[PDB]
Enzyme design. Sequence first.
Site, PDB file in Angstrom:
ATOM      1  N   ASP A 158       0.815  -1.240   0.000  1.00  0.00           N
ATOM      2  CA  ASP A 158       0.000   0.000   0.000  1.00  0.00           C
ATOM      3  C   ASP A 158       0.843   1.282   0.000  1.00  0.00           C
ATOM      4  O   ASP A 158       0.654   2.184   0.858  1.00  0.00           O
ATOM      5  CB  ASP A 158      -0.999   0.024   1.181  1.00  0.00           C
TER       6      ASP A 158
HETATM    7 MG   LIG Z   1      -5.598  -1.174   4.927  1.00  0.00          MG
END
Ligand SMILES: [Mg+2]
Lengths: 490, 382, 107, 95, 88, 159, 98, 387, 133
Positions: free
Chosen positions: I4
């Site tokens: 991420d």
């Molecule tokens: Mg997350």
Amino acid sequence: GQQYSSAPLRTVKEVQFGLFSPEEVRAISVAKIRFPETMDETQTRAKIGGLNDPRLGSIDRNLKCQTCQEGMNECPGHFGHIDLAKPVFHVGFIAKIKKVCECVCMHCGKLLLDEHNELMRQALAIKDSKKRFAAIWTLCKTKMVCETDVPSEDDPTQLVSRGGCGNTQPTIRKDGLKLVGSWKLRVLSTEEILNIFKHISVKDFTSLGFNEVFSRPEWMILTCLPVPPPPVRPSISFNESQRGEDDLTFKLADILKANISLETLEHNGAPHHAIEEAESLLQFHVATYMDNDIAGQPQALQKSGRPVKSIRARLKGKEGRIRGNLMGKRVDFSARTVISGDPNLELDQVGVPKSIAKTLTYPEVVTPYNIDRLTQLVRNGPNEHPGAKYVIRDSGDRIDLRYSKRAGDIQLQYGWKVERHIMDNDPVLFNRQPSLHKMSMMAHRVKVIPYSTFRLNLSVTSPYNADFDGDEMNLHVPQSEETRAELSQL
Amino acid sequence: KAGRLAEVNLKDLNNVKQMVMAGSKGSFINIAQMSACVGQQSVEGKRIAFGFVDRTLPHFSKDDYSPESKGFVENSYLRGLTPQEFFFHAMGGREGLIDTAVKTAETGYIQRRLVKALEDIMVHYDNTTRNSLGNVIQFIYGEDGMDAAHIEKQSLDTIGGSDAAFEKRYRVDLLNTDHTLDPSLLESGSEILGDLKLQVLLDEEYKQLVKDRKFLREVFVDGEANWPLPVNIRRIIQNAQQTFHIDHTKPSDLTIKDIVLGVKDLQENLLVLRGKNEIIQNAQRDAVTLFCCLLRSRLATRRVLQEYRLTKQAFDWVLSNIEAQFLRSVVHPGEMVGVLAAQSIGEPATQMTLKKVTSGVPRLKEILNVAKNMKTPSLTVY
Amino acid sequence: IFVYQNNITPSAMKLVPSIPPATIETFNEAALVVNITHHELVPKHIRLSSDEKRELLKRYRLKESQLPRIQRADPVALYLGLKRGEVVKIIRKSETSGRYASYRICM
Amino acid sequence: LRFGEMERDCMIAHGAASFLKERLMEASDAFRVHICGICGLMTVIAKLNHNQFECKGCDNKIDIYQIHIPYAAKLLFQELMAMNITPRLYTDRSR
Amino acid sequence: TLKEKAIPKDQRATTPYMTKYERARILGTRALQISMNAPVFVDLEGETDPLRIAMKELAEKKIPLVIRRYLPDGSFEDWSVEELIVDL
Amino acid sequence: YDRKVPSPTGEYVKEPEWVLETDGVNLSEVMTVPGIDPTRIYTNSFIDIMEVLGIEAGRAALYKEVYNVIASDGSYVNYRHMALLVDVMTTQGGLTSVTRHGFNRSNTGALMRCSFEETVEILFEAGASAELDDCRGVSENVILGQMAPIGTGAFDVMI
Amino acid sequence: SLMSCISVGTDPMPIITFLSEWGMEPLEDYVPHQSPDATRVFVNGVWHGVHRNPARLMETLRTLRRKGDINPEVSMIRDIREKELKIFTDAGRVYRPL
Amino acid sequence: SFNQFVDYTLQDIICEDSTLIYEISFGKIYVTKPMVNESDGVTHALYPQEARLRNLTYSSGLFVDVKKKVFIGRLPIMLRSKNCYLSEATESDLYKLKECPFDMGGYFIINGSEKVLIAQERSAGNIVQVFKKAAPSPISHVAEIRSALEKGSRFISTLQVKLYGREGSSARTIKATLPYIKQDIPIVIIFRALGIIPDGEILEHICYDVNDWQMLEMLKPCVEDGFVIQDRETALDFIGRRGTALGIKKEKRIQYAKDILQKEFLPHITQLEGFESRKAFFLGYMINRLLLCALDRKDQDDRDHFGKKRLDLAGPLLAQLFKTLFKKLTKDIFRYMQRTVELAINAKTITSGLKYALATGNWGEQKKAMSSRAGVSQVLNRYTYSS
Amino acid sequence: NQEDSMIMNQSSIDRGLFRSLFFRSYMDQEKKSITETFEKPQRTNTLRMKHGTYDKLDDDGLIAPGVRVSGEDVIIGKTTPISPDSKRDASTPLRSTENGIVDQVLVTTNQDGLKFVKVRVRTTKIPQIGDKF
DNA sequence: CTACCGATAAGCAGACGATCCTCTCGAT
DNA sequence: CTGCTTATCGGTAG
RNA sequence: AUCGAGAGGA
Ligand SMILES: [Mg+2]
Ligand SMILES: [Zn+2]
Ligand SMILES: [Zn+2]
Ligand SMILES: [Zn+2]
């Protein structure tokens, strides 16, 4: 940053829990506590001989703590005390005050079932003060009368002797703060129960979770209430000309007003009854300055709001004293920032960003080894990275390195302390909350980087359980070498 | 079945299948739902129940228990969920969010309690395990006095195998020209043939190996070989026959005594509890017992000499190594296990998120309460 | 050893500890139909002597109380008759080491 | 930043106690109070620079000790004292 | 009575090995003294870090510190950083 | 159910058995039945197991459930940790709960038991019963902010 | 959602005075045993009595609603297999169009 | 929701108890277009934009016609209400007013900060609900109705119709819990209290099918606990109740019960004299619902059904306050008059009593004990138009 | 870009991609015979003034709009005359962490007749390394 | 036969509830 | 979704 | 600076 003590210093070894005697309270204190006021004896802004001061801590940053001296930042705050004319119950002990009054009869004040009963014989020999009191209670709660005499164990007849007058013992109940029972109505006054425990035999204390010297039932109900000092209830707010005191200070004022609300009815105009109406409120406030969560009424206005605090809710779990300020303190030398991951780092490494490096510091002693790099560090100053602020000298004096006249100089002597920025390869604790592990709490190596993130290795992702979706992360820096060991070795 | 139809259709250059082939992100469900169909959604275990009393949404008739009316999404996320479907799916998703914000809540109450119940529990020194009162819990940490850090999964060869395959493996019979060590395996093999002083020592070896197999199977009724045990002998062995570069064509220089009285004297040197008095040294035996099964076990005259041929120089090293590594695996007096033991249970507790028996954090909530009011009670009669 | 086959009226259990040094132990027949110590879970309990107690209490250097405890009306402890001070030894089998010695003083 | 109760627990796992005393004394709060050898509480009047420690009532002059505890602790014990409970601190291992 | 105690040099039940915690604070307690300009008992081979020196002093068994190991009942066993084996 | 059991040849063969599973619990009367094996009958109620088969069986039974809580979710936690927890509960004599009713009344020093759930009262009765806190545990030394008897501070260095 | 609104809440009075003027036997004058084919009538959860043949009462109500004569907010809940008819004019019900 | 609170709800809340003891009796209310009388100055027409910069409250003055023209206080006005002015202004006019054309308002405003009134959700009153109870409970099912009026104060008289005794448990009695009361009353006594005396007529109000024997059998045990009390007069008599209740009664406790059944027992339906059968049917309908769910012919009542829940929105939200606020202004004039017995209006109470609530969250003035605390009126949120 | 994260073209950043203005507002009033005052402060027997420089304030005790503010720079100079036992400082500095340029400054008055001030400070903010998206 | 004592069953009531974190608003 | 207290019932003794 | 509320982050 303190002083020097003819008194030795030592680890705390034992902790003993007990109770306060009138004897102590009145001799342990220095304050008298006369007037229900706080300050301004007719406008005169000082201290006043009423509640705050007479031989206790000050406010206007003065060494006028009565030879206690020296600085608010030193005097723990003695204490004084408040002379309660009419005896007053204790709040958390209402349960036990009853319990004992269900174990001891009236008039003479004596154990209800002696060794003559052949079941009580399994209580006076059992260990622990806790389970013993749980044993006795189970037996002497049914039996009412003090008994004549009365066996004789063991055996036939007729009888022996022990002593006592056979009066009936009431069925005691909880009524807010008072204790009322039925005989076959009479309410048990505070003066009435104190006199029962002012006597009571020496082997009557020990028999049920108590102690000859440390804690007595005659102390359980409150003769003389202690007055806590100012450093437990601070002052102003948003004025510096319009007061604004704390809140435990407000409640003690309520007791003090109610205490000299009785003496203005004892030695002054004296009504015979409806004076018990005033005995409830003087008990109610000491029952509410110690706890405010029972049943009946809370509190409210002034000079403030509602409800109330009352010590106990400074103690109660979370954000209170123990679990909030003792077990888990807030701490200095720390940092937090959003993490992003770096493949060109080494596993044990952590990219501390530059500005955080200029902030956090480690005290290093000046040793013949490091001078050459350590003095350059003073010269670089608290702006350029491989630098330092604060230099500590012989007498514990503080050179602030980002002001001062002599800061582009300073010849460093041996055994001087110098707080320095964090440099590469320093050992630092680096955690993520919620901390579920050892392994959410790992030491790391430092490499000072540009950009505002904490940089760390993708393979250390798992034991901390982190994303880069905006996870922030904490960092702690030691302050002793020993700790610096205990970080990179454990 | 729709899933596995999509699984054996994904070519090898298909990126999603490749990340699953790596174990890097994703799994089979992820494939099934994206390519095939998302399946049957569930709330409180049971498939979508009626709100609108006898129907799920007002777009349907009453008393309709067919698949689509009770929340089965026939389409995949690539294809698109339908009006109804989407609300059904929403109902499921919401429960997920709900229980997560209630799991960690219930977990952090578990974790905190565990941590506070064990806390002061550490080793010390008498290698036992105790609290602040000095009330003993475990007499030897983890019943063997070993730190879990070092420990590894290792097959117990004695436990499995046929009574026919076992002898073949471990029996050295010198009085038997069909069961002797070939003069190709030992320097003395031909001279060792016969001999009545070395067939009371081998009969001493084989008899303890059989006392072991009856002892292990009495413990591990499962029939499972593989068990957590200190010191990886397999790897000390692989280290032996590559450090000393041993050819498997020329015979050893070991004696039959070297081996047999070697292993029995090493066993004496695997110290855990040290006290020189009767009771302690009796528990010393009752702590190494499983690891000594395993070392005999392994190693076994037949093993050492025929399976992985070892020299006397190498074998003396192996024996020296095992004792060395073994003393490293012991718990360090001072280890705080209280916390460590709580942390090790309270952590995966947090990693539980959703077939009739109560399971998961809800159950764990009973177990740690000693609950009289348990949801699923069950006898299992044999 | 009293072997009753239904129940005891509480006016009879109070005439049990009334003949020292002798002891009397009341046992129901519904609790004696199968031997509990035979069961998978229950390991072999072995009572030890007062001379071996002091041997345990000194050689592990403990306090009387500090030992793990067993109940007076404990199913196994009733099956062997443990008074206060009497300790059992328990030889349980473990997936970490073949054996493990446990001790329980009867409180 | 808060070094939470949950965070303490991780430092305990690691066996690092010298760090936990550093973090709960040197950082945060550290305070230098003064206990009576006899009566045990915080009564001693710190007449420093004059060497006097005269705790009256117990008539103590010599038997008085110095200790290093967090200010939160002193706050705790005082609050107990005000709630009519003696939390006594003793200097020696034996009773 | 102060005092005894104490448990003689004979009859030592304790691990003769130095524990990782015993090690970490031996280095710790020495690096406290090393950092503070105090006599060194080995030859410094171009290393200047106060903890790095305490490691070398440990490798050659030239640390004069003496451990007291406490057993629950109260008893302690004294071990020098010479008798103790470093093997971790 | 599937069982793994030794064949007379030596190996374990797969021999399947018939096992009955119940929705109620009364071990006091079920094992006393002709037909079933009363040396294998198991309950998922460790509280009953204790009551019937002694405290020591109570341990393992409580362990088997702590075990099935973990292993059912595809995790493995090493024996010693559960086995510790389990045993802490057991060593007082009966089944000690991991809640304020259980391990908080158990004679332990007040300060340590303060730092939990019933904070105030613990201090109260400590003042009443004249409790002597030993101060050898963790929380007690955290409160006083001192070298806690933990790993590092378990022993004591001298010259 | 986008389409949803909150009920503002009208006066119940014109509905009452309409029903009793279109059949609708008041509750007092109701005899249960000799009129079991009766739809009881509720208005803001007040039982105003019973109506016989509600079939034609409904379609008159629904038309007045759709025309405007009865506030288009007011919800008119006819239960077939329970013999109830409820007319709600509360201030808080959530409604949508369609 | 706010237009109904101004154009009406305001009117009628003023009336009712307005009439006083001569005859200071309130009437119509005129509502200004938002103004602000600033110190040493004129009455100024305050526009939205000015309010926010100046930390002012965009509120108009209330005026109410009193009897033998008068300023009552200031009501915060919801923007794009009614007269935010604005709700009249054309697009071009908005820019000159420095107010956004995309601004939809919602939000009126206090001390210069924009405030939103958040829809509150509770369970609707005046519905019959049946609830199957747990295992260790003596009662099995309970019929509950949160009976409360719509135009007349705020009296929440909750009524329970319980059905004790489990399935199996012999003789399942039905009792009910009345408001001012203390003990529980068998239902057969309640009916007889209203004026239905003969059984069979009793079970007619309850059971609406002669064939249905099963229900009728269910009621057999109830009647058995009745025929102690076989006449009206004595049925109001068995409301006692208990330990001690003054003592001096009989003819005074009968009139005590005779009020509770009209003023408290189902406060909807009506609250006056000539209604007894209007209620006994409803009570009989409750018992019908309770036993219809005890025979398992109909389900237990769904708690999460959205059609039996209501939203209190900005309108009836302000109503709650204005009722309480207006009555505190009223009962101040009654006490000014008392000391007069030979101007008076404290307009700040309503003005600042609305502002305080609409500023904080504590919907109910200085008490806060009303746990409406839940941030009713939150500080808008203008990070992005969609938010 | 693992776990991420993402990589953002700096070049695009510079041509204007996700750039943003950021505005913050500061506020002050006077009193509640004793009134607070707006003025560029001095010592005055006060010896309790703030840390940063008041040097950006003119004479009304406010910053002019064109100026540039950073760190502990004072924004609203305001003194409060106290007897009591002269003028004690009650000046609001620019936020510890913030920086940038003054946008508009508002001088008005409230219902009671109080000198009332709202300072608006403006910063441009560029898509930096740790910014969430 | 009646009265007292013990034991069991039913009914009512309490003390907490993820960790940290950053901001905004109103108040004696 | 739990421990403690009070009330009621069956049992034994005078 | 203290208390009381709500919004959001992991
Ligand atoms: Mg997350
Ligand atoms: Zn002082
Ligand atoms: Zn007496
Ligand atoms: Zn003292």
